[PDB]
Amino acid sequence: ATNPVIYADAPDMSMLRVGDTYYMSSTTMHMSPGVPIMKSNDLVNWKLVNYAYDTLANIPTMNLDDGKNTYGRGSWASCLRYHEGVYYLSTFAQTTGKTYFYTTKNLEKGPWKCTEFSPAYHDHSFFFDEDGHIYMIYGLFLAELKPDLSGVKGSQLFKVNGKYYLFNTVIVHRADKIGRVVFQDRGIAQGGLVDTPDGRWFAYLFEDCGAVGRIPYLVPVEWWPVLLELPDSRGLIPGIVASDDFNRKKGERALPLVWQWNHNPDNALWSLSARKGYLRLTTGRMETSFTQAKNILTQRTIGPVCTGSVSMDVSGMKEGDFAGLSLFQRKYGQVGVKVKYIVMVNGENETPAEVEKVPLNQQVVYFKAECDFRNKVDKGYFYYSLDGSNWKAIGNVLKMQYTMPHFMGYRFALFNYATKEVGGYADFDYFKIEDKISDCRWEDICYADDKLEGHKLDIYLPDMDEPSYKVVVLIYGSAWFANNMKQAAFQVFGKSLLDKGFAVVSINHRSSGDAKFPAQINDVKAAIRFIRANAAKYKLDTSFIGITGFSSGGHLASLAGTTNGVKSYTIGAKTVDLEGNVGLYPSFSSRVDAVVNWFGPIDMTRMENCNTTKGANSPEAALIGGVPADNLDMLALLNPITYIDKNDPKFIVIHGEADTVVPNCQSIFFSEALRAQGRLEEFISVPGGQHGPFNENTLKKMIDFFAREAG
Ligand code: NA
Numbered sequence: 001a002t003n004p005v006i007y008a009d010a011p012d013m014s015m016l017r018v019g020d021t022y023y024m025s026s027t028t029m030h031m032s033p034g035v036p037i038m039k040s041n042d043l044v045n046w047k048l049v050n051y052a053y054d055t056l057a058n059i060p061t062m063n064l065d066d067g068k069n070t071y072g073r074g075s076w077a078s079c080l081r082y083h084e085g086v087y088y089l090s091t092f093a094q095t096t097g098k099t100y101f102y103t104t105k106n107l108e109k110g111p112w113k114c115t116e117f118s119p120a121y122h123d124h125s126f127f128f129d130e131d132g133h134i135y136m137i138y139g140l141f142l143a144e145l146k147p148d149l150s151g152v153k154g155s156q157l158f159k160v161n162g163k164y165y166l167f168n169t170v171i172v173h174r175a176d177k178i179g180r181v182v183f184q185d186r187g188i189a190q191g192g193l194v195d196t197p198d199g200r201w202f203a204y205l206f207e208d209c210g211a212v213g214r215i216p217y218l219v220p221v222e223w224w225p226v227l228l229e230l231p232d233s234r235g236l237i238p239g240i241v242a243s244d245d246f247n248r249k250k251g252e253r254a255l256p257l258v259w260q261w262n263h264n265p266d267n268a269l270w271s272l273s274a275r276k277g278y279l280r281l282t283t284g285r286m287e288t289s290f291t292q293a294k295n296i297l298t299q300r301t302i303g304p305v306c307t308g309s310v311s312m313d314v315s316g317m318k319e320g321d322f323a324g325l326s327l328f329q330r331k332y333g334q335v336g337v338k339v340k341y342i343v344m345v346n347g348e349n350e351t352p353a354e355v356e357k358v359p360l361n362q363q364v365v366y367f368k369a370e371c372d373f374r375n376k377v378d379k380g381y382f383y384y385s386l387d388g389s390n391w392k393a394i395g396n397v398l399k400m401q402y403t404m405p406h407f408m409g410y411r412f413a414l415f416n417y418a419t420k421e422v423g424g425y426a427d428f429d430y431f432k433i434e435d436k437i438s439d440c441r442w443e444d445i446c447y448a449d450d451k452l453e454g455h456k457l458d459i460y461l462p463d464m465d466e467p468s469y470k471v472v473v474l475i476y477g478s479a480w481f482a483n484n485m486k487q488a489a490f491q492v493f494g495k496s497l498l499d500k501g502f503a504v505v506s507i508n509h510r511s512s513g514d515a516k517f518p519a520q521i522n523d524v525k526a527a528i529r530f531i532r533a534n535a536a537k538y539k540l541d542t543s544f545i546g547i548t549g550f551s552s553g554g555h556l557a558s559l560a561g562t563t564n565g566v567k568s569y570t571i572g573a574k575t576v577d578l579e580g581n582v583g584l585y586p587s588f589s590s591r592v593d594a595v596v597n598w599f600g601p602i603d604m605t606r607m608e609n610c611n612t613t614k615g616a617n618s619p620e621a622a623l624i625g626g627v628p629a630d631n632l633d634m635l636a637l638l639n640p641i642t643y644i645d646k647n648d649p650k651f652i653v654i655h656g657e658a659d660t661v662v663p664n665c666q667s668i669f670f671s672e673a674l675r676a677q678g679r680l681e682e683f684i685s686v687p688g689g690q691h692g693p694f695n696e697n698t699l700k701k702m703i704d705f706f707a708r709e710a711g
Contacts, residue, residue, distance in 0.1 A: 001232050004463065005044055007303035007373075008240050009213025009409025010078035012710035015194045015204045022194065023080060023107055024204075025052070025089055029408055030074035031260035031298070032056070035091050037080070037107055038240075042231040043194070043202060043218060046143035047239035052078070052089050055264045057096050064263045064292055071330070072097040076123075077154060083128045092120035099124065101149040107687035110249035117151040125155045125166075127178075135178060137166065141177070156192035165225070167192045169207075169611055170205065172225060181429065188217050189279050193225065205228050211304045211378035211400035212240040213370075213409025216417040219250065235435055241299045241306075243432045245604040246279045248272060250475035255297075260414070262328070270295055278313070281416040290332060290415070294697070298328060298411035300693065307439035308402040308412040313427035314340055315363045320420030325367040326413035329406045333398030335367050335382040336415070344395025345456045355395035356491060362386055363411075369412065370437055371400075378402075380410070381441045391463060391496065397443035438463065447507070450585045452512035454483040455582065457527050457676040459538050460494060461503050468541035470710045471526075471531055473592070476506070477551030477692075479619035480520055483511040488503040492694065493702070502704045502710075503540050505531060509556065513711060516625035517638050521579030524560050533585035545708040546594040548702065550692065552619075552664055555601025555640070558670065560644035561595035561651060569642070572633035592649060594709040598704045599655040599691060601662050602670045604628060604635040608632050610665035641673045650681045658689020681705060 011232040012027035022040040030234040035052035053075075056062055061070040089102040101115045126145060134145040137155045144153045156167045170183040170190075183189070183203065191205040200491040201221035209215045219227045237243075243259045249706070254272055266284055274280040276369045279297075286295050299308075310325050314337045317323060322335015322343075334345040334352075340360040366385035380398035383391045400410055412433065418424040440461045448455040461469050474489035476482060486506035497504050509523040524547075549557045566578050579590055601607060604620040605628075613628035613635070614620065621627060622635045636642055641694045651674050654668035667683070674680035682705070684698060 001044060001228050001230055002305075003217055003228060004207070004209070004215045004232070005228070005230075006046060006216040006236065006240065006299045007209075008215060008458045010038070010216050010240070011206055011214035012078035012154070013191055013204050013216060015192065015208065016080055016082055017194055017196075018082050020197060023082075023087075024077040025080040025091075027076055027078065027306065028074075028260060029076065030062075030070050030095075030263055030406070031408075032262075032264050033260060034075040035078050035089065035102075035232060036257070036260075037089070037284040039108065043196070044228075044230045044233050045239065046236075048496075050110065051092065051104045052112065053100070053256070055116075056093060058264070059096065062095055064294055067289070067292055069263070069291065072407035075100075079125050079156075080477070081126065081128065085160040088126070088647070090124065090126055091123065092122070094120055098573050099652075103149070114694040123154050125157045127157045127159070129159075130541070131177060136304040136589045140168075141264070154190035154396030158193045160193065160672070165193065170227070171204070174224070180224065182225055189220075190525070193221065193561065197574070199436050201225065207390070208402070209303065210373065210376040210402050211410050212301055212373045213402070215303065223298065223583045226430050226643045229522050233443075236300075237433065237435060242432050243300055243430065244279075245277070245430050246272060246428065247277050254584030258299050261697070262298060262299055263294070266294045268296075274425075275427055278429055280316075280425050280427050281323065281414065282316075282425040283318070283416065283422045285417075285422060286320075286419055287417045288419075289331070290326075290334065290352070290417075293417040294330065295416070296326070297414040299431075301327070301371050301373075301410045301412060301434065302433075302435060303372060305369045305435065307434050307437055308369045309430075309432040310367045310414065310619055311429040312337065312365050312367065313363055313429070314360065314365060314429065317426030318418065318421040318424030319423045321416065321426070323426035325369050325382075326415055327369050327371065327398055327400065328411045328413035328549060329400075329408065330403045331398075331401050333369075333380050333382060334415075334577075335369065335384060335394060337365055342394065344382050346396055346398055348399055355487070357390075358384065370441070371410070372437065377646075379443060390420075391438075392443060394436045395462065397453050399444065411688045438566070449529045452483075452510070452514075454508055454514055455526070456486070456503055457507040457530070458486055458490065459503070459505055460490070460498060461539060462498050464501065466501070466539075468539050469501065469547075470541045470544035471505055472497050472502045472508035472533075472546035472548065472706055473527065473552030473557070475505065475509065475524065475556050476551050477549065477598075478511070480512040480623040481619065483508050483514060489549065489553065493699075494552065496699050496703055497706070500707055502706060503538070510666065512619070517623050517634070518576045518578055520556055520562070520623070521559050521578055521638075522582050524556050525579050526582035528590045528592065529585045529588045530583055539625075545591070546596070546706045546710070547592045548596040548598065549600070551600055556595040557592075557595050558597045558602065558640040558651070559638065559643075560602055561591050561638045562645075562648050564648060565589045566643055570635060570643070573637045574631075574633040575638060576634070576637045589703065594649050594650045594706055595706065596654065597664050597670065598694070599659050599667060600653075600670075601642060602666045603633060603639045606665070606669070610663060641670060641682075644677055644679060645671050648679050649676070650705075651679050651707060652682050652684065652702065653680065654684040654686070654702075656689030659691050661691045
């Protein structure tokens, strides 16, 4: 029984009481239907009962025609009143520069008598006075409305106890006929007064809580007003957001009130009688933009965490169509079946970005979208699935940002649109929403105390519920040039390790552009230090931490392997701090228990023709910030062979016979040095070859090895 009383995007509240009931209008801007009315009995448990209108206007901006929109605009702050048996609801819109008035004797069922006129009065608060005139404030200005509401002859006005209090930081204006600071706390502003039958006062207001949107707040009021002891809440399901099996009894609302379209729907192109138990979105138009697509169906996202889901059927789809689930704003995130490949897109940046792509060989497919708003971390994880339960992660994390436009919370979104060919369809069996979260995925976690992307890692647990998981780290091949390719490492190893029962931790390291060696190994050891220190939190059994990587990721994993317990080292004139002071957990161990090295470079003194150094242009020259031939000491210091001993971990080195960037010989140099001191478990020489083209058998041996050393 706490605040926020609604952890969801319900901005520009206009609230009132009528007996034992509470009512509240709201802003959804460019959604259809518009101006949602919500009912409550306790000020705590809310539910949608009605909307003021279906569509606002039949104009290109509102209809998403001719590449035009009205995102952020549409129906804005409304005014809700009850006077002598009739409910009175007003809003305005810059989308048509008009003010609209709606009246009914039953706020839940209707019907509405409607009127409209120009201009739009900005955040107007109309009021019935006991002098018998209908006033209206806005901006601030005062004026008198006509009787039949066909024209005129965050302001919210309330007369209490024969004094006029206008709400607008919150700033109340008192007056006897028709100025202080009353609240200044986390910018929780805009609203008015509401009383309880027993005479307790509250101020209904909202905060900007980031991605989730703009969330209602109730504050107790004492008497001037001076800004929870209310019944127990039962969340926002099914009041504000609900699941839908898309099954309808005789004469039932076709779409629960929880549903609102993006802009004016094309009501020709969706149906619930096409396939009984299924929603069928059909295409009408070829699009160049996701946000110019019609018949995107939506509910709100909810805090503090949430998860949406769907089941689809792709048989109907045509060449170039794209239908799935979205976390939807300007900076959106998709996951769906494009034509068939399962695909994620990340539209954070201007151009959309297809991240990962799996082929589909079924027609029934599932999707899931998670949201972590907890302390405004504001991240969206997408998954797919071919099955009821077995959820396969896909693509990067969506770093949600509350942008303007669309000036709205992130919504779940069912979509299906064409790029090449119209007529195709996509069935949806159900939509499912829950206030739970898996917490089997944390991406873009900082393992040092900085914002640098070089110091970011992604955690992944197996979804098989177990108190703790043994860890395996992934480093990426970049020739030490990338600080941002931990996502690529996951797509290669991730799934296979996860099925065996391993927690996976792909990490980033600072590029050779950012810093020079030993920055790269300093980072690896810091990521590991972080894992142990935060182990309890992410259910990580750090009795075992494996580590692996391809090319430079193999190099760094190997160098990590041989330097267990090594603080520094000195060859010739050159010393090199091998552990570092990157994070804030130097207390903890940077050890690893098992290494697998995929065709990593090792000895750059024999990198060229298995003999000599390379030029000042080669990746190793960039890594040390110096010309290899003349920095022969430093090349040995970053060589893992240097640090091999009997009590180092077991290794598995793997390398193709036709690898044209890192030769054969590098791995063999390493495996011989190891095996001599009993460290090499297995050297694997793939006849195929090539720097990556990594197969069923080689992959399976990685798993079986990590499993043997872990148990
Ligand atoms: Na050693």
